[PDB]
Ligand binder design. Structure first.
Ligand SMILES: CCCCCCCC/C=C\CCCCCCCC(=O)O[C@H](COC(=O)CCCCCCCCCCC)COP(=O)(O)OCCN
Ligand SMILES: CCCCCCCC/C=C\CCCCCCCC(=O)O[C@H](COC(=O)CCCCCCCCCCC)COP(=O)(O)OCCN
Ligand SMILES: Nc1ncnc2c1ncn2[C@@H]1O[C@H](COP(=O)(O)OP(=O)(O)NP(=O)(O)O)[C@@H](O)[C@H]1O
Ligand SMILES: Nc1ncnc2c1ncn2[C@@H]1O[C@H](COP(=O)(O)OP(=O)(O)NP(=O)(O)O)[C@@H](O)[C@H]1O
Ligand SMILES: [Mg+2]
Ligand SMILES: [Mg+2]
Lengths: 585, 585
């Protein structure tokens, strides 16, 4: 309820502040007319109360002008209220777009660890419920809480000024009792809403976790156990929502009992004032009409807005998504990369763990030199994608430096660092789009001749010549509508279309046959000139990197050896010699 | 608006029908009291209108009983309305649970092609918006549309009976004008709501597609292009929502102008009836009070329920998810599998394409015999996971048979078929849970000694002995918090814990080193007895299946050859000989 006010009453941009003030003026004029209309009703009743002695005479125009003033006052109240709702809905819709676009870019700016420590369907559900919560809070605050509070203020002022201080005592007493009762029963009521919110979040989490892994559910026949794990949280949500609605019905019944006792005591005191002759029947109909037209929107406010604290909770968690902490960022004076330099990465005394408990790269130190196709081998789980994500600066180590041409990568701009490093990862997800949009995702501003020659360069041409909708077939959710071989060839096509300088191939071939991997490695080695690209092959198939220029052996950090292939085979008892021997036998 | 009525007024289960009838009776009694209360106001006004000649006398109890009847009638109306809302909220919450649980199981019952041709975040968003739409439609239909229609009916009846037929003419004319104006401006208004719904769905789709592939966005620096593709649909949604709210403000202003003209003409005709002496001032305050307490909830109905056709659209698309067509199902008299038989699969004249355009298995015919570790090789894209999904009966072919022990698999129960077939797939997703819950997902009713010996059997023991929270480390979203090697060893641990009979290994080793794959294949070959499990290895690493019992060569369907390894190497120019030669060179 603070950053929303910062968005609807910002610093600068005086046009939206003028629109907010126009909405406030229309609100004030609408409530003034809605208080003026029972005075016209009192006038047309207390004027008609005289004794008429002629059934054939028309009514005088002095009463017709008061009846027309009643009608014009009622319609003017409704018209001004709806114009206020129109202009503040324009302001609210602009605030909703700017908060959605300002939270999406900051959701994109965060590091990889925060995204892997969350759930993307949960993020999308939180963003959607926060947007609908912002809409519901602004709609409730421009229609229900603010106008009825202003109406209570002006009706209490009218009843203080017009009919002495006993009505002031009655109105102050019933506002005091109303506030005490509402505060006590809301402090009782919030626990069931907390339980309902927790049960609904657990239900959505189990439904999403069972719908993403549909193949891993139907492989092991766990439909019934997942349905029961869903059903338990559904029963908890049903019990908590039933108790929420029953306690809110008790809230509304007690509140409107207090207000009905107030209205009946006000009409009774007005009647015994009429007995004394100080008042008239116009005061009776004025007092009832004022308190009744105050009592009806209080009932509808308490009824139809049963979820407003939940909307504040959703708005607050959307702003908490907005107000998180990005921890990977460029320095104060960021340097820029040179123009024609093959880059040689150098790790000195690096040490990094994804959590502070374990340390993956226990004092690793090596160098990837420029222009040489180097190759990283190692046992499964020895941190090779770790040093990939450390060059790419997704994370940052605890000690050591990640130097490029002597300068650190902490002092480089992160976009100018990530624009020269092309990479295929181990597990490749795709977009729910065609093959053409997925290949063209490398360079957006790329001509289609380059896209065609890259697709025919990445050994994907017979697949497009065999498909009936080539460069148009939708690959479905996450690339699951094609196999693993076409997915890895598509990722290699993306990196070949980007045409970067470093080219980290992180398991470039895992699900391709021997002929396709040999033709693909031949047409990648035949692509670029000597000493231009600093190609880094993270590979387990040791035959594919037998012709490499420098091989680096990893075993849970602490690089054991590095050198050419013949020297590593002619070494007395290395790890690469044993891996090559079990490969050849 | 039909299946919702089928859920709130079902066949059988008479307790919820008694609860619905109790809600309807409380609604009728609440509206009867709300029509009775201005008659008590007319009584206490027309009784107080006499000439009082004493300021010191107390008011008579004959007026105090009418004032107490006014207060009791108002509070009884509010109390009966809130009790009705309570019991129908109980019915609505039970209907919401049973529709969520009845749509989740049918979302699980569908085939794989429907799930791959959709988006899981879209399914979760549709389920959540359909649930909130069911809640909003039932809350609106028990509080706004039905009670105000019943109130309009009884107030029109009162004004027909009590004050002649001229008020009947006025009320019928203003209902006719109200209906004509509402129908015409709603037929104008629905287009902007359609555009807003399309823009919101496209915005949510682009946000989810960019948040799932966060690594593939940050690899290629496409933050700004995705932000602009988000921003365009956000601007379309903002324009359409602004036009929706402005047209709804025009709707409410015109409707309440018609009703204000009706109320002013009714008060004018009542006044000129009072001039004739037939009526009194009690009729004036009765007519205004009745039409005013009808006019206020019509205004709040038109205002606060600005999204009800959207709630019907979300409810009908949730029911459309419920009323889809499952096309993979067991027969009328499903057989069951025998008790101790090693199963031998036999494909005869099979032909299957995922779409009717292309045909993957162009007349394939082979046999996987029982007790033999067979091995499928082939070029990348030749349909190996296709015949995996055809044995598992995710899909069904166009011709040919998929026989097991002579009998077809169309006449077997699908759960008794899927309970003997264990399988690891190519791309393995995991649950957002620990390693213990992910290994235990194979057999839920498995003792923990079996889980420990399977984890130490699937070569995962040094990872658990190196982790600081072994069997407790959360693997994050979709298993991305561990590497590919631990993911494939986890899937092999799942299949080893299920202890099935067939064991389709679909690229069991793609991201493991040579030592780990050799130890894993040795401890899998040392597990089961001879001639018990009909192990089927879909493999590209031809060294891992050199000791297989029967190798089958695929190339875009139409199985080329099948036989042992030595006979396939000693063949004049086969495909497997060329793959083995490029493997050895
Ligand atoms: C969130 C809180 C924001 C601030 C809260 C507001 C606090 C002020 C609350 C009440 C002030 C009203 C004081 C009542 C005295 C009005 C005198 C009065 O009775 O005038 C009424 C119309 O009243 C009327 O039309 C109503 C008067 C409306 C003017 C006050 C509205 C505030 C303007 C800013 C006409 O009846 P009469 O007695 O015959 O007129 C006497 C001469 N005008
Ligand atoms: C979705 C549509 C569902 C059906 C639509 C309803 C259709 C029926 C609509 C109107 C019927 C009302 C007919 C009005 C005649 C009532 C006579 C009357 O004026 O009684 C009022 C109270 O009325 C009252 O208290 C109001 C009478 C309420 C009784 C009718 C409610 C329906 C019961 C079922 C008391 O005033 P009096 O004239 O002094 O009483 C005369 C003797 N009782
Ligand atoms: N976000 C993460 N949080 C915790 N551990 C992680 C995370 N990412 C990777 N790891 C762990 O860190 C260890 C090695 O990291 P990793 O760099 O992924 O090895 P790897 O080279 O990819 N293994 P492989 O794919 O078989 O070659 C393993 O225990 C991983 O599970
Ligand atoms: N739902 C699908 N819709 C359309 N095509 C599909 C679908 N699933 C798989 N395919 C295509 O069908 C062809 C081969 O299917 P597939 O069985 O996945 O081959 P594969 O053996 O897995 N290839 P590989 O992983 O390299 O061994 C390929 O063109 C796939 O893209
Ligand atoms: Mg790795
Ligand atoms: Mg395959």
């Amino acid at each position: 309820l603070k950053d929303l006010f910062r968005y609807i009453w910002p610093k600068g941009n005086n046009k939206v502040r003028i629109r907010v003030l126009i909405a406030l003026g229309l609100l004030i004029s609408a409530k003034i007319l809605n208080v003026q209309v029972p005075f016209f009703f009192k006038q047309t009743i207390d004027s008609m109360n005289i004794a008429w002695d002629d059934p054939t005479v028309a009514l005088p125009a002095a009463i017709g002008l008061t009846i027309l003033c009643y009608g014009v006052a009622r319609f003017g109240s409704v018209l001004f209220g709806e114009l206020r709702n129109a202009v503040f809905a324009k302001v609210a819709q602009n605030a909703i777009r700017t908060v959605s676009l300002q939270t999406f870019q900051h959701l994109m700016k965060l590091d990889l660890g925060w995204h892997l420590s969350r759930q993307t369907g949960g993020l999308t559900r939180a963003m959607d419920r926060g947007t609908k919560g912002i809409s519901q809070v602004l709609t409730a605050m421009v229609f229900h809480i603010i106008p009825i509070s202003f109406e209570i203020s002006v009706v209490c002022g009218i009843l203080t000024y017009q009919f002495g201080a006993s009505f002031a005592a009655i109105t102050f007493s019933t506002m005091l009792l109303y506030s005490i009762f509402t505060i006590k029963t809301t402090a009782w009521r919030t626990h069931f809403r907390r339980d309902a919110n927790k049960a609904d979040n657990k239900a959505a989490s189990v439904a999403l976790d069972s719908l993403i892994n549909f193949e891993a559910v139907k492989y092991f026949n766990n439909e019934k156990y997942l349905a029961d794990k869903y059903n338990g949280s559904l029963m908890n949500y049903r019990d908590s929502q039933i108790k929420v609605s029953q306690s809110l019905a008790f809230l509304n019944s007690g509140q409107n009992l207090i207000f009905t006792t107030a209205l009946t005591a006000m009409m009774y005191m007005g009647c015994t004032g009429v007995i004394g002759g100080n008042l008239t029947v116009g005061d009776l109909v004025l007092i009832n009409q004022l308190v009744f037209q105050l009592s009806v929107p209080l009932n509808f406010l308490g009824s139809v807005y049963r979820d407003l604290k939940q909307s504040l909770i959703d708005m607050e968690t959307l702003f908490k998504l907005r107000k998180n902490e990005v921890k990977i960022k460029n320095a104060e004076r960021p340097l820029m990369l040179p123009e024609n330099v093959p880059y040689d990465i150098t790790f000195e005394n690096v040490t990094f763990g994804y959590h502070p408990d374990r340390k993956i790269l226990k004092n690793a130190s090596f160098t990837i030199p420029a222009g040489w196709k180097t190759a990283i081998v190692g046992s499964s789980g020895s941190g090779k994608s770790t040093i990939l994500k450390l060059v790419f600066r997704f994370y940052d180590p605890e000690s050591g430096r990640i130097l490029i041409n002597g300068r650190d990568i902490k002092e480089y701009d992160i976009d100018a660092l990530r624009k020269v490093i092309g990479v295929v990862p181990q597990d490749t997800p795709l977009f729910n789009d065609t093959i053409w949009e997925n290949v063209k995702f490398g360079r957006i501003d790329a001509t289609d001749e380059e896209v065609i020659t890259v697709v025919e360069k990445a050994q994907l041409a017979p697949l497009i010549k065999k498909l009936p909708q080539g460069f148009d077939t939708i690959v479905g959710e996450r690339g699951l509508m094609i196999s693993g071989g076409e997915k890895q060839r598509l990722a290699i096509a993306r990196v070949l279309l980007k045409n970067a300088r470093i080219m980290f191939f992180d398991e470039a071939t895992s699900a391709l046959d021997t002929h396709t991997e040999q033709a693909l490695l031949r047409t990648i080695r035949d692509n670029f000139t000597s000493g231009s690209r600093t190609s880094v092959y993270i590979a387990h198939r040791l035959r594919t990197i037998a012709d490499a220029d420098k091989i680096i052996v990893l075993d849970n950090g602490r690089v054991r050896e590095e050198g050419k292939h013949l020297e590593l085979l002619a070494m007395p008892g290395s790890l690469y010699r044993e891996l090559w021997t079990i490969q050849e036998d």
